[PDB]
Subunit: 219 residues, 6 copies
């Protein structure tokens, strides 16, 4: 089957990471396909909103390390992450790129970069404190322990936690609310939020990149 499933219904495009046999690990092929699908959704006049999710039971375990710069494209259409299970390391970075997250009761979040001896290059060290808080981000990154869905909700990492079998139902509800609004305005306002975020995070992203380069050279 394809590594990425694509559905478009009611102006909402759902992109489902589809390597469950490998915990939806981001192989070179899946990365290429996923990032291209985001760009294609942005360019497709039939699409107002994107949902990103994973084939059960894991959302995304991270980069395919067996097999082994940022790639997530500039978008003005909203991206909703429907986190169905574990979102780990590069998969947590994928979740952190989304505009809005909704979680299954089964979702959990972890950063194992330190454990596997890697430094983050897709924004974890910038966006995790931004979205879960400074102390909790540090606790996650230094322990490698899982953060539960309920704790993710308490911390602000996700907007909503629902029963597992209601996850895509819930994501479709949020998408439908967006679809009902003025799309020119939705896109203008989201572009602006993105520009403000880029202004506030770029120095940090450079610092993250520099720390990764220094790690690779020393290691």
């Amino acid at each position: 089957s394809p590594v990425l499933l694509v559905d478009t219904t009611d102006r909402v495009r759902t992109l489902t990471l589809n390597r469950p046999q490998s915990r939806n690990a981001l192989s070179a092929e899946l990365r290429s396909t996923f990032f291209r699908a985001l760009s294609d959704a942005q360019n497709d006049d039939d699409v107002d909103v994107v949902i990103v999710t994973g084939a059960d039971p894991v959302f995304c375990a991270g980069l395919d390390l067996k097999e082994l710069s940022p790639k997530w494209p500039d978008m003005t259409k909203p991206v909703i992450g429907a986190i169905n299970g574990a979102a780990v390391t590069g998969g947590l970075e994928l979740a952190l790129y989304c505009d809005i997250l909704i979680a299954s009761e089964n979702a959990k979040f972890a950063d194992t970069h330190a454990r596997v001896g890697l430094m983050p290059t897709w924004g974890l060290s910038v966006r995790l404190p931004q979205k879960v808080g400074v102390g909790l981000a540090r606790r996650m990154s230094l322990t490698g322990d899982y953060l539960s869905a309920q704790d993710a909700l308490r911390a602000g990492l996700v907007t909503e936690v629902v029963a597992h079998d209601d996850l895509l139902t819930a994501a479709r509800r949020v998408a439908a609310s967006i679809v009902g609004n003025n799309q020119k305005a939705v896109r203008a306002l989201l572009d602006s939020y993105h520009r403000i975020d880029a202004l506030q995070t770029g120095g940090a992203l450079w610092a993250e990149a520099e720390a990764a380069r220094q790690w690779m050279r020393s290691t």
Copy 2:
């Protein structure tokens, strides 16, 4: 009756938005009167603390669109928003300007800018992510849906949620605690918090203003 009610008791000045027949919409007259009242409170040696609230049952529905730059003045005296009902769009921006918010169980918060085809110019796109979190701000702005008082408390937008008939009781308790402190120090510390906030948000506020101008020109 006047569009703005003013009371001063125990060194606390309460400013009550008073156009309930129009959901306390910010007409030109109410904007002028309100912003002047803030400045007058700052200049009045009989006042230590301001409470802003609305005539029931709505806090503020936003700019008077039927009738139709930032105006909130530099202040060193604390402003407590006692949110008694819906705070929508420009009214949510008014709430976001306050130093400290307390909510009735009946309070709710929404951003309808996208729905009505307007871009924010009173800081919503900067202060909403700052005070409710990135994902929740994006969810609010893109859906236009209401955020409940309890969810506002969970997210950090408000400090306290109380029964409706205890709202101004609660706001007076917080004000009285402030009044009991060293007012020179209260003002020096709040001025400093404001200066730090201005330093951290100005680039973003410029970006918001630029996005609004680009919207007006394109639209």
Copy 3:
């Protein structure tokens, strides 16, 4: 007895503020000793993680005012604050320096700078809004009221609240999880988080310092 107790067990160094007769107030001697102990822990190859706590029942009441620039050193080893009781003013600033906080059910947090007519110089006005939110930080600083452990957890100031007699048990669990990871990577990632934080907070820290100097001169 010494003003600072030191234990090293399982590569974790616990530094216990030990002036309970004075609410663990930071005398000149305790400040010197504590800040030196942090540096010594950083330099000691037998130590991976630091826990900071207080002799019961107070964590730290602040600077010793009876007796009466920032001193907390650059560190790449994680510092866990185990807050056992009240953390007030300079003691709240000590808590705010920690990477990760865990609280006893008995912990409480307050800022009395305004009440005692002092401006903060150890980062309270920068780190309190960063870690508890803008409105709650302003409410704390202007009222001087205590924030409970449960409210600190809701707000994101602490990562976990436990029964009092489980506090150091809990802190040791988090420390042990860190100790089990790749220490080169733990330190590289924490150094990076610190560098990103320094980049984002330095302007604010300057503003805080300038406001303190202006207060001292005017007062």
Copy 4:
């Protein structure tokens, strides 16, 4: 005659401010026409480079005060200012918007905002120190005195000073060099320079706007 002359030769569009009877003062009509012409040049596939100049003997004396937000559009095509005479106040702000300036021996530059009791809103207080240096910008703004073409060259405000009758010859030489390069790359690189500049100047531009608003309200 039209208030703005337009020529397109060798893929270079020259926009000549054409109200010499009024020192090329920026009336409402000329502002509208000029800013629209910039946008039209950006959108016109027949144009690679813009030259802005004035009908002799003045470049631009500023806003038409007799008759009486920023409007200069986002552009990726280079704009060369050929300063033929005095560039004063709003006219100095027009010069400061250009990517590259070349001056006649007759060019001179002045800021009279203070003298006429106005605050700048088109970036003078940000871009003048950026392009002529801090001390010289302050000297200009506080004295209102003219800066000569030679002193403008020494300071870095202009790239080249030529005999008056060679001014547009010189501007065409620079334009032709640009036209000979890879235009996709020229535009990508200039867009990037503009984005970097926007990141570095936005906070300052907000501060300038806030100071102007405070002036208007106080005055």
Copy 5:
């Protein structure tokens, strides 16, 4: 004689550093007196403009090291430095605080911090690259060599170089031009320039302060 001479003529207050027997070194007394005189000038309605100069033949050799935080106050009135001779180390920092510099042909500028084993705490490491350029600032600081008046003019550190016996004549000319303008506007515009500068330099000033503290502790 007094350590600081004061004259007020034509609404211009000249403050002359007056310890020529000690190369106008900034003793505790002279620092106190000078910084107070700046504040007094700001508060004195008889004064529009300040000139700072030194008793010949040295402007200021720096802190009085024999005898041995920033103190220069917030001002909205312009300060013109008339540099009559050598401006070294702390004296170069005094020059760097001025809004506008004019130099005698005899002026020269040097940074000897490294040579004497001190780190700067009055902004040299921020303002020297800002006002003379990155490479030249680094060359000055690392060599300790003098920068001539002509080279200071070329680099942008000073606005004008005049014969020695014309120095205060020249400074009075610039002051008189300022005095002829709208003083409300002069002050509003200079306050704004100062606020923009503070926004852009505060992070750097914190970094300078932190580097000095780290030097003192290591040394």
Copy 6:
């Protein structure tokens, strides 16, 4: 012969780019060797100061395009660029990394990125406006024309221009002045200048990197 010549005399290490047959183009081998030599100089207690120069008659023509992230290491020892001839594109970026530049009368500087259809990734778009001014940087990048040594001196890109046969004589004079100072202080002060620069430029460097990635993907 080796691609990089190394000499150490009087505590000064001269690194001479040595592929004159290829205009000192930065092949993979020369990049590796050069960047390693910088790190080795930093680590070598026999070295206080580095001079970088090229085998005549070209300084560095840029990346070896025939053959075809930033690599310049963190250093606290000063690096003096002695620019002996043309410094083009990547070679101009090498020059821009140096702390202090001195030029031969034969030096010239150019940016051909646009001409060859490449975006800069070694800081040209950040450091060129920083060191030569905004307008001149834009003129250089968009024209591809050479900047002369004298114009480089006028603009602030270099500190000194000397006869060609005096170039390394001059560089040794500056190095010797540095060597005569307190080396602990030289390094502490330069580290601080570098940290301040990193704070001020990181956001811009991220933006440059993002623009390059977007170019590679579109192209």
